[model samples]
Target: NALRDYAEARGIKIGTCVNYPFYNNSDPTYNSILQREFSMVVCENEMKFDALQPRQNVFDFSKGDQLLAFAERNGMQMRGHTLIWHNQNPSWLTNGNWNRDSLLAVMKNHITTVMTHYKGKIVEWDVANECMDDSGNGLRSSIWRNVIGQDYLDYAFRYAREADPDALLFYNDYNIEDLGPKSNAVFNMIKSMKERGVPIDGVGFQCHFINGMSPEYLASIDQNIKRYAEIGVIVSFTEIDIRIPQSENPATAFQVQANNYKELMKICLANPNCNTFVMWGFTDKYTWIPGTFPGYGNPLIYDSNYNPKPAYNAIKEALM
Candidate 1:
């Protein structure tokens, strides 16, 4: 059985990122693996601001439509990423000189318009991604924070709910999987929001890690998810990857990575709120580690030739 089949037996969802090239049928193996092994899909960059609405008063849903169609045809569930973020923003909005009212208007329009476009098809949406400070500050200072203040999240979730009441809104971030200052800040905010009646439903922990992982340092992951569940919100492993350095021995490094996969999956499966486990990318061939992290690579579950790696089998074993 495939990863999805095993994961489905456990009553959870296993998904991977689908970019334009692979989902468009450029490579049969890429699409084939997705069809067989995954149960859900999210666009890598197609739904972002720059890709969706590059110019003011102009929106491009071509790429978003393509991915949704592919998901539907394959009988897969679809998720929406990032109604708002500081990165990948169009030049028009980022470069514009605007006051509080003008900027909030733009943000509301962006969230409502995008959410309504694919209303029921995508139920779970990450309303604001990486909006908390890594330095333990209250909130990360972005255009949304600076212009609209912290209530930007207030408006974001409310607007999303208004647009689609069936949608599950989430605040997603990297480095929040661990019990650190960053996650502390995020947890406090989530608690405050829930107490104050914020229209939020979930939080996403982007579990990007280096080699040498174990249950010891990662023990906080289980606590973090359970803690969020106590606050009455869902927790998801949004983007997961364990990368070994390029200079390491191939076989040895892979074995360690395999152990790391099972290590995290145990924590994931242990927490009921953490039902959705979506990898950053499925194959090592198209990973973002080398391009983003200088020397780190091979962070995915598949080899360059499209064969399942030890990491894949580790998950299968964990789910089994």
Candidate 2:
């Protein structure tokens, strides 16, 4: 009846980021379409640090709980968006001046508290998000990395493990879908973590690609997933969206986007380690692409009017 059923038949999860405001008292058409189309849900912003802990040592779960309840009611499994990341930090946490012990306590407290709150729920957690360098060298110099040392990821994973012994803990990052230096750097990092018994269970490739990606190019993505599987960790295409550039022509633009989506989904299907396929958002109506990359809109499966775009059909075709 929907992408949900089709994906279930294939043993894969098809998901989208459910923005809270839109669903907080969201429109009926939006909610209806979302419930029908997907089997997995992730809070686009509500589960992040800023929303989860707006004040130091104090936590807010209104938005996160709201979204989780919605997913559960509709029979959708949820993925906890993150535990720690350089972006989207509260002023209290980000703006703090602290020594190693202070920051470590803060990190452990946040991970333990928030994760424990949703312990029985939340099947998987992005324990750390996008902690790589643009230069493809080493870990990105974040407040966590600077203060807690390179062992911060190890610490975070352990804290989350202690918080929820049953949940799958993942290290999520962007620009690491291909088998290049950046991907290799992350692969090596997780491989080292696994060897050292860090309790890391997965790697999330934030496949935020641009338009016109061919299967030939995305084969490297398959290769990348294969390598990650070799390290004995789950793999997922976490934040996938192929955007058309600002200057592109709409007439031919979406078709290119469609092929890219189809190819990438097929890559996910081909790789047994990759089980979940989550779009950054499903509809163009609420996309983060235009706001982030001005004039580059329509980067989703559905058009603004809720009609399935070429990309949606492309994904369905791939699922078959």
| Local accuracy by lDDT, each model | 0.87, 0.87
Stretches of candidate 2 exceeding 4 Å from the true structure: none
lDDT of 2 by residue, 1-320 (tens): 68888899999999988864465566778888888899998888888898888999789998888878888898999999988999999898877889999999998899999988898899889999989897779989989999889788888998899999999999999888888888889989999988998899999988888888867678888888888878788898888888888799986998899988888878888888889999998878887888888767788888888888888888888888
Listed in order, each prediction's TM-score against the native is 0.97, 0.97
Backbone collisions counted per model: 0, 0
145 Cα displacement, candidate 2 (Å): 1.2
Model 2 poorest 10 in a row by lDDT: 19-28
lDDT of 1 by residue, 1-101 (tens): 88888898998889988855685578887877888889999989989888888898688999889888988888788889878998999989888998889
Give the Cα-based TM-score of candidate 2 against the true structure: 0.97
Distance (Å) between predicted and true CA of 282, model 2? 1.1
Question: How many pairs in model 2 have backbone atoms within 3 A of each other, for residues 3 or more apart or on separate chains, i.e. clashes?
Answer: 0
